[PDB]
Design a protein around this ligand. Structure first.
Ligand SMILES: [Mg+2]
Ligand SMILES: [Mg+2]
Ligand SMILES: [Mg+2]
Ligand SMILES: [Mg+2]
Ligand SMILES: [Mg+2]
Ligand SMILES: [Mg+2]
Ligand SMILES: [Mg+2]
Ligand SMILES: [Mg+2]
Ligand SMILES: [Mg+2]
Ligand SMILES: [Mg+2]
Ligand SMILES: [Mg+2]
Ligand SMILES: [Mg+2]
Ligand SMILES: [Mg+2]
Ligand SMILES: [Mg+2]
Ligand SMILES: [Mg+2]
Ligand SMILES: [Mg+2]
Ligand SMILES: [Mg+2]
Ligand SMILES: [Mg+2]
Ligand SMILES: [Mg+2]
Ligand SMILES: [Mg+2]
Ligand SMILES: [Mg+2]
Ligand SMILES: [Mg+2]
Ligand SMILES: [Mg+2]
Ligand SMILES: [Mg+2]
Ligand SMILES: [Mg+2]
Ligand SMILES: [Mg+2]
Ligand SMILES: [Mg+2]
Ligand SMILES: [Mg+2]
Ligand SMILES: [Mg+2]
Ligand SMILES: [Mg+2]
Ligand SMILES: [Mg+2]
Ligand SMILES: [Mg+2]
Ligand SMILES: [Mg+2]
Ligand SMILES: [Mg+2]
Ligand SMILES: [Mg+2]
Ligand SMILES: [Mg+2]
Ligand SMILES: [Mg+2]
Ligand SMILES: [Mg+2]
Ligand SMILES: [Mg+2]
Ligand SMILES: [Mg+2]
Ligand SMILES: [Mg+2]
Ligand SMILES: [Mg+2]
Ligand SMILES: [Mg+2]
Ligand SMILES: [Mg+2]
Ligand SMILES: [Mg+2]
Ligand SMILES: [Mg+2]
Ligand SMILES: [Mg+2]
Ligand SMILES: [Mg+2]
Ligand SMILES: [Mg+2]
Ligand SMILES: [Mg+2]
Ligand SMILES: [Mg+2]
Ligand SMILES: [Mg+2]
Ligand SMILES: [Mg+2]
Ligand SMILES: [Mg+2]
Ligand SMILES: [Mg+2]
Ligand SMILES: [Mg+2]
Ligand SMILES: [Mg+2]
Ligand SMILES: [Mg+2]
Ligand SMILES: [Mg+2]
Ligand SMILES: [Mg+2]
Ligand SMILES: [Mg+2]
Ligand SMILES: [Mg+2]
Ligand SMILES: [Mg+2]
Ligand SMILES: [Mg+2]
Ligand SMILES: [Mg+2]
Ligand SMILES: [Mg+2]
Ligand SMILES: [Mg+2]
Ligand SMILES: [Mg+2]
Ligand SMILES: [Mg+2]
Ligand SMILES: [Mg+2]
Ligand SMILES: [Mg+2]
Ligand SMILES: [Mg+2]
Ligand SMILES: [Mg+2]
Ligand SMILES: [Mg+2]
Ligand SMILES: [Mg+2]
Ligand SMILES: [Mg+2]
Ligand SMILES: [Mg+2]
Ligand SMILES: [Mg+2]
Ligand SMILES: [Mg+2]
Ligand SMILES: [Mg+2]
Ligand SMILES: [Mg+2]
Ligand SMILES: [Mg+2]
Ligand SMILES: [Mg+2]
Ligand SMILES: [Mg+2]
Ligand SMILES: [Mg+2]
Ligand SMILES: [Mg+2]
Ligand SMILES: [Mg+2]
Ligand SMILES: [Mg+2]
Ligand SMILES: [Mg+2]
Ligand SMILES: [Mg+2]
Ligand SMILES: [Mg+2]
Ligand SMILES: [Mg+2]
Ligand SMILES: [Mg+2]
Ligand SMILES: [Mg+2]
Ligand SMILES: [Mg+2]
Ligand SMILES: [Mg+2]
Ligand SMILES: [Mg+2]
Ligand SMILES: [Mg+2]
Ligand SMILES: [Mg+2]
Ligand SMILES: [Mg+2]
Ligand SMILES: [Mg+2]
Ligand SMILES: [Mg+2]
Ligand SMILES: [Mg+2]
Ligand SMILES: [Mg+2]
Ligand SMILES: [Mg+2]
Ligand SMILES: [Mg+2]
Ligand SMILES: [Mg+2]
Ligand SMILES: [Mg+2]
Ligand SMILES: [Mg+2]
Ligand SMILES: [Mg+2]
Ligand SMILES: [Mg+2]
Ligand SMILES: [Mg+2]
Ligand SMILES: [Mg+2]
Ligand SMILES: [Mg+2]
Ligand SMILES: [Mg+2]
Ligand SMILES: [Mg+2]
Ligand SMILES: [Mg+2]
Ligand SMILES: [Mg+2]
Ligand SMILES: [Mg+2]
Ligand SMILES: [Mg+2]
Ligand SMILES: [Mg+2]
Ligand SMILES: [Mg+2]
Ligand SMILES: [Mg+2]
Ligand SMILES: [Mg+2]
Ligand SMILES: [Mg+2]
Ligand SMILES: [Mg+2]
Ligand SMILES: [Mg+2]
Ligand SMILES: [Mg+2]
Ligand SMILES: [Mg+2]
Ligand SMILES: [Mg+2]
Ligand SMILES: [Mg+2]
Ligand SMILES: [Mg+2]
Ligand SMILES: [Mg+2]
Ligand SMILES: [Mg+2]
Ligand SMILES: [Mg+2]
Ligand SMILES: [Mg+2]
Ligand SMILES: [Mg+2]
Ligand SMILES: [Mg+2]
Ligand SMILES: [Mg+2]
Ligand SMILES: [Mg+2]
Ligand SMILES: [Mg+2]
Ligand SMILES: [Mg+2]
Ligand SMILES: [Mg+2]
Ligand SMILES: [Mg+2]
Ligand SMILES: [Mg+2]
Ligand SMILES: [Mg+2]
Ligand SMILES: [Mg+2]
Ligand SMILES: [Mg+2]
Ligand SMILES: [Mg+2]
Ligand SMILES: [Mg+2]
Ligand SMILES: [Mg+2]
Ligand SMILES: [Mg+2]
Ligand SMILES: [Mg+2]
Ligand SMILES: [Mg+2]
Ligand SMILES: [Mg+2]
Ligand SMILES: [Mg+2]
Ligand SMILES: [Mg+2]
Ligand SMILES: [Mg+2]
Ligand SMILES: [Mg+2]
Ligand SMILES: [Mg+2]
Ligand SMILES: [Mg+2]
Ligand SMILES: [Mg+2]
Ligand SMILES: [Mg+2]
Ligand SMILES: [Mg+2]
Ligand SMILES: [Mg+2]
Ligand SMILES: [Mg+2]
Ligand SMILES: [Mg+2]
Ligand SMILES: [Mg+2]
Ligand SMILES: [Mg+2]
Ligand SMILES: [Mg+2]
Ligand SMILES: [Mg+2]
Ligand SMILES: [Mg+2]
Ligand SMILES: [Mg+2]
Ligand SMILES: [Mg+2]
Ligand SMILES: [Mg+2]
Ligand SMILES: [Mg+2]
Ligand SMILES: [Mg+2]
Ligand SMILES: [Mg+2]
Ligand SMILES: [Mg+2]
Ligand SMILES: [Mg+2]
Ligand SMILES: [Mg+2]
Ligand SMILES: [Mg+2]
Ligand SMILES: [Mg+2]
Ligand SMILES: [Mg+2]
Ligand SMILES: [Mg+2]
Ligand SMILES: [Mg+2]
Ligand SMILES: [Mg+2]
Ligand SMILES: [Mg+2]
Ligand SMILES: [Mg+2]
Ligand SMILES: [Mg+2]
Ligand SMILES: [Mg+2]
Ligand SMILES: [Mg+2]
Ligand SMILES: [Mg+2]
Ligand SMILES: [Mg+2]
Ligand SMILES: [Mg+2]
Ligand SMILES: [Mg+2]
Ligand SMILES: [Mg+2]
Ligand SMILES: [Mg+2]
Ligand SMILES: [Mg+2]
Ligand SMILES: [Mg+2]
Ligand SMILES: [Mg+2]
Ligand SMILES: [Mg+2]
Ligand SMILES: [Mg+2]
Ligand SMILES: [Mg+2]
Ligand SMILES: [Mg+2]
Ligand SMILES: [Mg+2]
Ligand SMILES: [Mg+2]
Ligand SMILES: [Mg+2]
Ligand SMILES: [Mg+2]
Ligand SMILES: [Mg+2]
Ligand SMILES: [Mg+2]
Ligand SMILES: [Mg+2]
Ligand SMILES: [Mg+2]
Ligand SMILES: [Mg+2]
Ligand SMILES: [Mg+2]
Ligand SMILES: [Mg+2]
Ligand SMILES: [Mg+2]
Ligand SMILES: [Mg+2]
Ligand SMILES: [Mg+2]
Ligand SMILES: [Mg+2]
Ligand SMILES: [Mg+2]
Ligand SMILES: [Mg+2]
Ligand SMILES: [Mg+2]
Ligand SMILES: [Mg+2]
Lengths: 88, 62, 100, 92
RNA sequence: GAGCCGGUAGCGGGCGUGGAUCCCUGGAUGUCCGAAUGGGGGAACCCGGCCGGCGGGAACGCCGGUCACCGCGCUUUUUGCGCGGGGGGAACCUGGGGAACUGAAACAUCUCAGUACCCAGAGGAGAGGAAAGAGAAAUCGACUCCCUGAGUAGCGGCGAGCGAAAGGGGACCAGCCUAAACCGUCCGGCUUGUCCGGGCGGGGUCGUGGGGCCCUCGGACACCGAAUCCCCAGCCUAGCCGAAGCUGUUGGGAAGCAGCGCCAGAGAGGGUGAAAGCCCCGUAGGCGAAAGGUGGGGGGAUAGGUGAGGGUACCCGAGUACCCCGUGGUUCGUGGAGCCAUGGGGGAAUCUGGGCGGACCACCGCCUAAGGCUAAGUACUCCGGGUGACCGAUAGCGCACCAGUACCGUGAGGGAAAGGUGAAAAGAACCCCGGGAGGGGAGUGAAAUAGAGCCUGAAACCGUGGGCUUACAAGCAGUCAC
RNA sequence: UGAGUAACGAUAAAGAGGGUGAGAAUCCCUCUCGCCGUAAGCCCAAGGGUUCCUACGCAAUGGUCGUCAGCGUAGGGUUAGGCGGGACCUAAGGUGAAGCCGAAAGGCGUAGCCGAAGGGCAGCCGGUUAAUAUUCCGGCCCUUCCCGCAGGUGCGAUGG
């Protein structure tokens, strides 16, 4: 999946194997294949409660940057999932 | 023609109307229950009465 | 709608076949079939009786529905096509020159 | 909507024979309850009902010429009137 | 404006100029199932909460109301309340996925083809859209669609194949709102601050670069103007008016033939016993809406918008540009491979910035990315209308007809056959043989070999009658002679 | 065309008298004969959906005939607190709050809910109709629920 601040699906783009010179020629073999987004979990606190993020490796920082913006935010209310959501 | 007269007497049945109409239908549904019975035994009914009545009930229901 | 046509119940001339020139009043008009009965066409229904109730029911020669296009209305003359002049309120058919 | 439960008296040798006992019987709404039958037949012929039997009548399937069809179903019900009393209306 | 209680006659019984049936508009009522939504479930059934009612009615039953889930927002968590989603639609549309036969005269790259099909979503369209454009003109100026450019330029086991764009001709025509600097305010937090952050308001939107703040101009009533709002015209959802012929004759029946005559902004076409401008329905021309729908086309209002100079360098969309690895798109199959896109890695700048003009470098040009919206011109035909050197019942849609039926299949699904009396029912009283069927006579009709799956009624096939011929004959059945 | 040909679906089997009727080997009755009898008899479940009963009727359906019928037209016929199912329980399975997974569609899943020919639950004998019967009736017998009373006691649950 893709899920979080990430915003990245999983693109199906082929991988074609070839045999060759480049200084004599270059020929082929080709098939569809699915490229996945490097993707990790990120646990963080945010007031009370924990809260995980199924984010891509790229935007791991964005998530911390989000908790920083959350300090300026008024939250609580037994909001486990609810925080994440209201957490933009 | 029958309509005209019958219908006026219904906003005319506005003296205790809502209640009155209700009471009225009740008797009307019954007058017709008499018919459906009499028609059932056959020799004791001459049509229209039943539909004219059914239709009265209806508009009256309004 | 629009099924309506020439005259209603009244005096009419037959420009048909076996009764051309004949005259009579129309005693019925069947729009569902676009025809009218006058006093002209008459056929013999040897038939015993139409419906089982009643023993005898007649050899009646009664009038056969006449096609509505073989009959023309008529007044102080020989029957004219129908115009329509509306009064100062309603509307009524004036013939080719007179009322009614 | 109360004379709408009882539809019509059922006319049969079998139904007439029930008149001997306090057993009157007539066609009723198919979605009718033995209980609502009671409170209806009661307030329509002014008589205590003691017992109600009901049953459905699968409608016979007729056919006119090449056109094949079906009659409508009905729920027949037989009321038992308190000892003594009677429905003159049916007594014809 | 005279009839009417559908197709549908009959038994039975009613209604209409106190204007019915019928047609147009709006409203009412609308069982149960179905997104199906109180809960259940083997759709069309079963069981229940809360509130009010019905019965003697607390047990039972019924009636009215109400109670799914999900998103967004007020609700302080709360529990609430409020607007929205759900499902369907022939084709058309966009997005996420995505074949093989076949072609290459085998086959793997390649082709078929980003087609078929599956999925999600949009809507009367959808997508796209105001330039980090194109590309060689110190030129053009959003997007879309058509013509052309062009079978060009290219791509290609340089095979089979595939196949652009700019430019020109047309249709249509429209541009806009935000992010950020800075200013104000509401709330939170905390290392109380000349702060951090979140929300709300002002401000601002560009490539002759624009914007912010500061100073000078005068800063202005004016000037522009909606794609939002109001009204109106028009239009659609019933209708109405509408010219002019009569006689004779053949005939079952004239609309034919003959006589004389008439209208025409109408001699389109349909019907009437056959062949009709003038009999009927129409057609030409013209008339029409209380109610619903539509409606800048016309008219009006609001939102919104519009200037010059000087100075400061604050701002001008980030895991982005940018380079590398893996790919997709494009005419581009790794090719000298740029451009647009992006899964992995590294990772900036804010105009002395940054992208591009086919590797790269220089020069000279073009253009301002990483937020968003936008009518028309375009596509389609479930639906209504019009028209045909389109069909005429083995054709034409599978269905002219009670067909997605009968029937076949567990099911997905397959899928027929079947139209015509006659001008009129005048559909054959009554008698005759017969249990009936079905005949014979009578009668209707122009016609009954039009008598009822009845117009015409072909062929194979079965039959009665008649003519010629055949039982000592050898055969593609004919042919020639007598 | 084959062709009035093969066949007319178990070798348990027939005969006669009477009646009905337009018509009878074929329908009705009677007598005789034969076949089945752990079934070829009776009762229940599934499936089937009016084929049940009665009146009228024979064109077609019936491998012949047909007055007959499972066939046509029409009328009637199926009665429950205790039988069976449901307003009870849970099984495999299914579904599915929470939770997890997946390009979309979707996949998995605790509780819970659904799910029975299992667990649980109150009726027996006889009569009656052309046609129903633990269903109507008769006799005898029983269950749950609401209200009131009398007596009794810490009563009280999806928890143990
Ligand atoms: Mg995930
Ligand atoms: Mg990524
Ligand atoms: Mg996704
Ligand atoms: Mg690879
Ligand atoms: Mg090389
Ligand atoms: Mg190659
Ligand atoms: Mg391939
Ligand atoms: Mg492949
Ligand atoms: Mg981690
Ligand atoms: Mg979480
Ligand atoms: Mg990284
Ligand atoms: Mg913040
Ligand atoms: Mg909460
Ligand atoms: Mg909570
Ligand atoms: Mg949420
Ligand atoms: Mg909030
Ligand atoms: Mg009163
Ligand atoms: Mg009264
Ligand atoms: Mg009312
Ligand atoms: Mg008249
Ligand atoms: Mg007579
Ligand atoms: Mg005269
Ligand atoms: Mg009887
Ligand atoms: Mg009885
Ligand atoms: Mg009592
Ligand atoms: Mg009782
Ligand atoms: Mg029952
Ligand atoms: Mg039947
Ligand atoms: Mg009429
Ligand atoms: Mg009628
Ligand atoms: Mg009718
Ligand atoms: Mg009728
Ligand atoms: Mg009639
Ligand atoms: Mg009638
Ligand atoms: Mg009558
Ligand atoms: Mg009419
Ligand atoms: Mg009508
Ligand atoms: Mg309506
Ligand atoms: Mg109602
Ligand atoms: Mg429902
Ligand atoms: Mg609801
Ligand atoms: Mg459900
Ligand atoms: Mg209550
Ligand atoms: Mg009550
Ligand atoms: Mg309701
Ligand atoms: Mg309720
Ligand atoms: Mg949920
Ligand atoms: Mg919700
Ligand atoms: Mg809201
Ligand atoms: Mg909320
Ligand atoms: Mg509020
Ligand atoms: Mg608030
Ligand atoms: Mg809330
Ligand atoms: Mg409160
Ligand atoms: Mg709350
Ligand atoms: Mg609520
Ligand atoms: Mg709620
Ligand atoms: Mg709201
Ligand atoms: Mg919608
Ligand atoms: Mg939709
Ligand atoms: Mg695609
Ligand atoms: Mg895709
Ligand atoms: Mg192959
Ligand atoms: Mg091969
Ligand atoms: Mg391709
Ligand atoms: Mg596609
Ligand atoms: Mg979705
Ligand atoms: Mg949809
Ligand atoms: Mg559009
Ligand atoms: Mg868009
Ligand atoms: Mg812009
Ligand atoms: Mg291609
Ligand atoms: Mg091609
Ligand atoms: Mg082109
Ligand atoms: Mg061009
Ligand atoms: Mg152009
Ligand atoms: Mg045009
Ligand atoms: Mg322009
Ligand atoms: Mg602030
Ligand atoms: Mg916010
Ligand atoms: Mg702001
Ligand atoms: Mg703002
Ligand atoms: Mg502004
Ligand atoms: Mg300004
Ligand atoms: Mg710009
Ligand atoms: Mg500047
Ligand atoms: Mg200022
Ligand atoms: Mg001043
Ligand atoms: Mg100024
Ligand atoms: Mg605007
Ligand atoms: Mg019009
Ligand atoms: Mg209209
Ligand atoms: Mg008029
Ligand atoms: Mg005329
Ligand atoms: Mg003439
Ligand atoms: Mg003469
Ligand atoms: Mg002559
Ligand atoms: Mg003559
Ligand atoms: Mg003449
Ligand atoms: Mg001639
Ligand atoms: Mg003249
Ligand atoms: Mg036409
Ligand atoms: Mg001619
Ligand atoms: Mg003509
Ligand atoms: Mg006109
Ligand atoms: Mg007007
Ligand atoms: Mg008006
Ligand atoms: Mg317009
Ligand atoms: Mg202003
Ligand atoms: Mg200004
Ligand atoms: Mg300046
Ligand atoms: Mg700067
Ligand atoms: Mg961002
Ligand atoms: Mg960043
Ligand atoms: Mg920045
Ligand atoms: Mg960073
Ligand atoms: Mg990256
Ligand atoms: Mg850059
Ligand atoms: Mg680059
Ligand atoms: Mg890599
Ligand atoms: Mg590599
Ligand atoms: Mg790359
Ligand atoms: Mg692709
Ligand atoms: Mg490529
Ligand atoms: Mg190509
Ligand atoms: Mg390629
Ligand atoms: Mg490439
Ligand atoms: Mg790139
Ligand atoms: Mg990347
Ligand atoms: Mg770039
Ligand atoms: Mg360029
Ligand atoms: Mg270059
Ligand atoms: Mg450029
Ligand atoms: Mg730009
Ligand atoms: Mg930018
Ligand atoms: Mg922009
Ligand atoms: Mg933009
Ligand atoms: Mg954009
Ligand atoms: Mg758009
Ligand atoms: Mg077009
Ligand atoms: Mg059409
Ligand atoms: Mg048409
Ligand atoms: Mg046409
Ligand atoms: Mg034609
Ligand atoms: Mg045919
Ligand atoms: Mg056909
Ligand atoms: Mg034919
Ligand atoms: Mg045929
Ligand atoms: Mg069709
Ligand atoms: Mg059709
Ligand atoms: Mg049918
Ligand atoms: Mg049909
Ligand atoms: Mg059909
Ligand atoms: Mg059919
Ligand atoms: Mg059928
Ligand atoms: Mg079958
Ligand atoms: Mg089947
Ligand atoms: Mg066939
Ligand atoms: Mg047919
Ligand atoms: Mg007749
Ligand atoms: Mg005869
Ligand atoms: Mg006689
Ligand atoms: Mg006889
Ligand atoms: Mg006789
Ligand atoms: Mg006959
Ligand atoms: Mg006969
Ligand atoms: Mg004869
Ligand atoms: Mg004759
Ligand atoms: Mg003749
Ligand atoms: Mg003939
Ligand atoms: Mg025949
Ligand atoms: Mg003919
Ligand atoms: Mg012969
Ligand atoms: Mg001979
Ligand atoms: Mg001869
Ligand atoms: Mg001879
Ligand atoms: Mg010989
Ligand atoms: Mg010879
Ligand atoms: Mg033969
Ligand atoms: Mg023989
Ligand atoms: Mg024989
Ligand atoms: Mg033989
Ligand atoms: Mg033999
Ligand atoms: Mg034999
Ligand atoms: Mg055999
Ligand atoms: Mg055998
Ligand atoms: Mg005998
Ligand atoms: Mg007989
Ligand atoms: Mg005899
Ligand atoms: Mg005998
Ligand atoms: Mg015998
Ligand atoms: Mg018999
Ligand atoms: Mg034995
Ligand atoms: Mg044995
Ligand atoms: Mg069972
Ligand atoms: Mg049957
Ligand atoms: Mg009897
Ligand atoms: Mg009897
Ligand atoms: Mg009999
Ligand atoms: Mg027979
Ligand atoms: Mg037979
Ligand atoms: Mg007999
Ligand atoms: Mg029978
Ligand atoms: Mg028991
Ligand atoms: Mg039970
Ligand atoms: Mg249960
Ligand atoms: Mg259960
Ligand atoms: Mg359970
Ligand atoms: Mg379980
Ligand atoms: Mg799911
Ligand atoms: Mg999902
Ligand atoms: Mg599951
Ligand atoms: Mg289930
Ligand atoms: Mg259960
Ligand atoms: Mg059980
Ligand atoms: Mg059990
Ligand atoms: Mg017992
Ligand atoms: Mg008992
Ligand atoms: Mg016992
Ligand atoms: Mg029995
Ligand atoms: Mg008993
Ligand atoms: Mg205790
Ligand atoms: Mg205690
Ligand atoms: Mg206790």
């Amino acid at each position: 999946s893709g899920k979080r601040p990430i915003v990245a699906n999983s693109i199906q783009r082929r991988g074609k194997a070839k045999r060759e010179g480049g200084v004599g020629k270059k020929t082929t073999g080709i098939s569809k294949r699915r490229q996945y987004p490097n993707l990790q979990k990120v646990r963080v606190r945010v007031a009370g409660q924990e809260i995980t993020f199924r984010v891509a490796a790229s935007h791991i920082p964005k998530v911390y940057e989000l908790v920083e913006r959350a300090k300026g935010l008024r939250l609580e209310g037994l909001s486990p999932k609810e925080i994440k959501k209201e957490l933009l | 023609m029958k309509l005209s007269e019958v219908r006026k007497q219904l906003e005319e049945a506005r003296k205790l109307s809502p209640v009155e109409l209700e009471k009225l239908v009740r008797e009307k549904k019954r007058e017709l229950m008499e018919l459906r019975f009499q028609a059932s035994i056959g020799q004791l009914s001459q049509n229209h009465k039943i539909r004219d009545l059914k239709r009265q009930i209806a508009r009256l229901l309004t | 709608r629009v099924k309506m046509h020439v005259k209603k119940g009244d005096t009419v001339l037959v420009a048909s076949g076996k009764y051309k020139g004949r005259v009579g009043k129309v005693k019925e008009v069947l729009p569902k079939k676009y025809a009218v009965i006058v006093e002209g066409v008459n056929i013999v229904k040897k038939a015993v009786r139409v419906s089982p109730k009643y023993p005898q029911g007649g050899f009646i020669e009664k009038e056969a529905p006449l096609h509505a296009s073989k009959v023309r209305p008529i007044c102080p003359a020989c029957g004219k096509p129908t115009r329509v002049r509306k009064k100062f309120l309603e509307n009524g058919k004036k013939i080719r020159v007179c009322a009614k | 909507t109360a004379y709408d439960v009882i539809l019509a008296p059922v006319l049969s040798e079998k139904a007439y024979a029930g008149f001997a006992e306090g057993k009157y019987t007539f066609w009723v709404h198919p979605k009718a309850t033995k209980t609502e039958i009671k409170n209806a037949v009661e307030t329509a012929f002014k008589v205590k009902v003691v017992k109600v039997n009901t049953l459905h009548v699968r409608g016979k399937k007729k056919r006119l010429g090449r056109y094949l069809g079906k009659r409508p179903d009905r729920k027949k019900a037989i009321v038992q009137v308190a000892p003594g009393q009677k429905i003159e209306a049916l007594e014809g």
